[PDB]
Amino acid sequence: MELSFGARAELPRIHPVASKLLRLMQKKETNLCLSADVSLARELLQLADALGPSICMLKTHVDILNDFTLDVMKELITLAKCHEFLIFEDRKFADIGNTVKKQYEGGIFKIASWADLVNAHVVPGSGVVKGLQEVGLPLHRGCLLIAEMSSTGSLATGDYTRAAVRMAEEHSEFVVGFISGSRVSMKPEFLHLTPGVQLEAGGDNLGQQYNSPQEVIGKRGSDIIIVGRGIISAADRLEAAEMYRKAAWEAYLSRLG
Amino acid sequence: MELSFGARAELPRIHPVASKLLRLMQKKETNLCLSADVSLARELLQLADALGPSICMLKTHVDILNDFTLDVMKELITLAKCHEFLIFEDRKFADIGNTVKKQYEGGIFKIASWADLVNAHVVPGSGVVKGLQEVGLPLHRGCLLIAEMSSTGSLATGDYTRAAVRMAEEHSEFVVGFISGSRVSMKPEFLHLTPGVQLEAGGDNLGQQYNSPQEVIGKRGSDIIIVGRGIISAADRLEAAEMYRKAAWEAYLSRLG
Numbered sequence: 001m002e003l004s005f006g007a008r009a010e011l012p013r014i015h016p017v018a019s020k021l022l023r024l025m026q027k028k029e030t031n032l033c034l035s036a037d038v039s040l041a042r043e044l045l046q047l048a049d050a051l052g053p054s055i056c057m058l059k060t061h062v063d064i065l066n067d068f069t070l071d072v073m074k075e076l077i078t079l080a081k082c083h084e085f086l087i088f089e090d091r092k093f094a095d096i097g098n099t100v101k102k103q104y105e106g107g108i109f110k111i112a113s114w115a116d117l118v119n120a121h122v123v124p125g126s127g128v129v130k131g132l133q134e135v136g137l138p139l140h141r142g143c144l145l146i147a148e149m150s151s152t153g154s155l156a157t158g159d160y161t162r163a164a165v166r167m168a169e170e171h172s173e174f175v176v177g178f179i180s181g182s183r184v185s186m187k188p189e190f191l192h193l194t195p196g197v198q199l200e201a202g203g204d205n206l207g208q209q210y211n212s213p214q215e216v217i218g219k220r221g222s223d224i225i226i227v228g229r230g231i232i233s234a235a236d237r238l239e240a241a242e243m244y245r246k247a248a249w250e251a252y253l254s255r256l257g
Numbered sequence: 258m259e260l261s262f263g264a265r266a267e268l269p270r271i272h273p274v275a276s277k278l279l280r281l282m283q284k285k286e287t288n289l290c291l292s293a294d295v296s297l298a299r300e301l302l303q304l305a306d307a308l309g310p311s312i313c314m315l316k317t318h319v320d321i322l323n324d325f326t327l328d329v330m331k332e333l334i335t336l337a338k339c340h341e342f343l344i345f346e347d348r349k350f351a352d353i354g355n356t357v358k359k360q361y362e363g364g365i366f367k368i369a370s371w372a373d374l375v376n377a378h379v380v381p382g383s384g385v386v387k388g389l390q391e392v393g394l395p396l397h398r399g400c401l402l403i404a405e406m407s408s409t410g411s412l413a414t415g416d417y418t419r420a421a422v423r424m425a426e427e428h429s430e431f432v433v434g435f436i437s438g439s440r441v442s443m444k445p446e447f448l449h450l451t452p453g454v455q456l457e458a459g460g461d462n463l464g465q466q467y468n469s470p471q472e473v474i475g476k477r478g479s480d481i482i483i484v485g486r487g488i489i490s491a492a493d494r495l496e497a498a499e500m501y502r503k504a505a506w507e508a509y510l511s512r513l514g
């Protein structure tokens with residue numbers, strides 16, 4: 001039984017961060033996350049401002065920003081509130097719990113202070129989630145677990161993916177969904193976000209593989225497309241964003257009815 | 258037909274970085290890597306200077322340093338050159354090749370500019386290594402692949418571990434060995450480095466598990482122990498470093514002869 005984003009936002013077990021997201025997806029008619037894979041703060045903020053209306057989420061790699069400061073992140077928060085989107089830092093945590101706790105809270109980035117969402121690899125075992133949760137819980141943050149990857153030779157398959165699902169189910173106070181290539185849980189309170197998305201067929205020269213929004217959202221039952229180069233490489237990033245938005249939104253609408 | 262570290266340093270297929278490491282290990286009689294898990298530059302630099310003579314390597318998490326600057330790294334390299342140890346950034350890369358390339362070279366940290374060694378998880382497939390190599394090779398760097406993890410519930414087992422070994426063999430120009438709990442490769446040009454080490458049985462509250470140096474080096478056939486809290490939390494960190502060095506060194510001597 002397929003529910004709209006708006007209905008899912010009111011599910012009994014839903015995390016407030018997942019609720020917030022689903023509500024804005026419904027309101028704005030977007031299930032598109034911009035992967036803002038740029039090196040300049042000015043470009044990041046210019047993309048966030050311009051594309052903000054078209055997106056439900058902006059995904060960051062702050063460790064690639066040459067001119068990162070916390071003040072940059074303050075302005076990004078301002079744009080996120082204005083345009084109504086979540087910020088997701090794609091840190092892809094993959095260490096022991098005691099370490100990831102500090103990497104999340106601390107250092108120069110202070111990721112927990114500005115990121116609504118983060119993600120973690122499950123390879124280290126559930127300790128990884130426990131450590132993140134000690135930081136994220138009071139801050140009303142959420143976490144996505146990496147159940148599958150988009151890249152060639154990914155080992156995130158079979159029993160590995162199944163472990164990802166179990167680990168999410170067991171930490172549903174904090175874990176709000178998955179990075180995956182398709183639906184991996186049947187629990188509707190879980191979000192499925194899918195990278196490796198482009199309109200055109202292809203890949204890159206470093207193992208990345210692309211599937212279309214229609215395939216990912218429509219056929220494979222994912223919720224949100226994550227799109228970097230498909231948009232960022234365009235001349236007009238706004239036009240490209242709208243193209244991806246409409247593709248993902250209509251694929252979603254068709255699955256519902 | 259087990260060779261000494263000194264002999265392994267001279268193997269025809271040895272990587273230059275491994276060779277440099279192996280030689281200093283023999284020279285200093287140390288197969289101990291300090292995990293310098295601290296939040297202040299001053300403390301990182303003080304531990305490096307004080308414990309430098311006892312260690313073959315210093316493992317960093319730069320993303321937990323509250324006051325990182327490239328100047329702090331410049332100074333660490335000075336100490337590394339003085340005391341003769343390598344710098345290993347435990348970045349645990351776990352993303353697509355295109356992304357890790359930028360995370361390794363770029364951002365605020367510019368890891369490749371100062372870390373002799375980095376490590377990577379094998380979960381994304383070989384693209385993760387291809388991406389890092391692009392930066393690492395011109396900069397005369399090495400990489401370790403994470404074949405096993407020390408934490409409870411680790412998924413880095415069986416076929417995954419085998420996959421890591423194959424990936425290293427196929428990228429021997431850049432990959433110099435492993436993060437593992439035991440010997441995973443029969444090829445003597447590869448290093449094995451083992452975290453999750455303390456003299457006493459136990460663990461932490463967040464899934465870390467400990468085995469002793471004699472167990473790891475002696476019975477399980479690893480080359481180097483990685484030790485954080487076992488040293489840093491001791492009252493006397495110098496004496497602590499010396500105990501771990503002597504344990505790991507003796508264990509190595511015994512396995513050899």
Ligand SMILES: *c1cc(=O)[nH]c(=O)n1[C@@H]1O[C@H](COP(=O)(O)O)[C@@H](O)[C@H]1O
Pocket residue numbers: 035037061090148149150151179195196197208226227228229230352353356
């Ligand atoms: C993370 C996990 C994964 O399985 N695949 C990924 O590509 N990523 C990240 O998503 C973005 C993909 O961007 P693009 O191929 O659309 O440009 C990227 O930031 C990568 O790190």
Ligand SMILES: *c1cc(=O)[nH]c(=O)n1[C@@H]1O[C@H](COP(=O)(O)O)[C@@H](O)[C@H]1O
Pocket residue numbers: 095096099292294318347405406407408436452453454465483484485486487
């Ligand atoms: C990395 C990989 C692994 O399998 N286990 C690990 O513990 N780590 C890193 O090694 C250090 C262990 O420190 P300690 O338990 O001796 O204090 C730590 O920096 C962890 O991130």
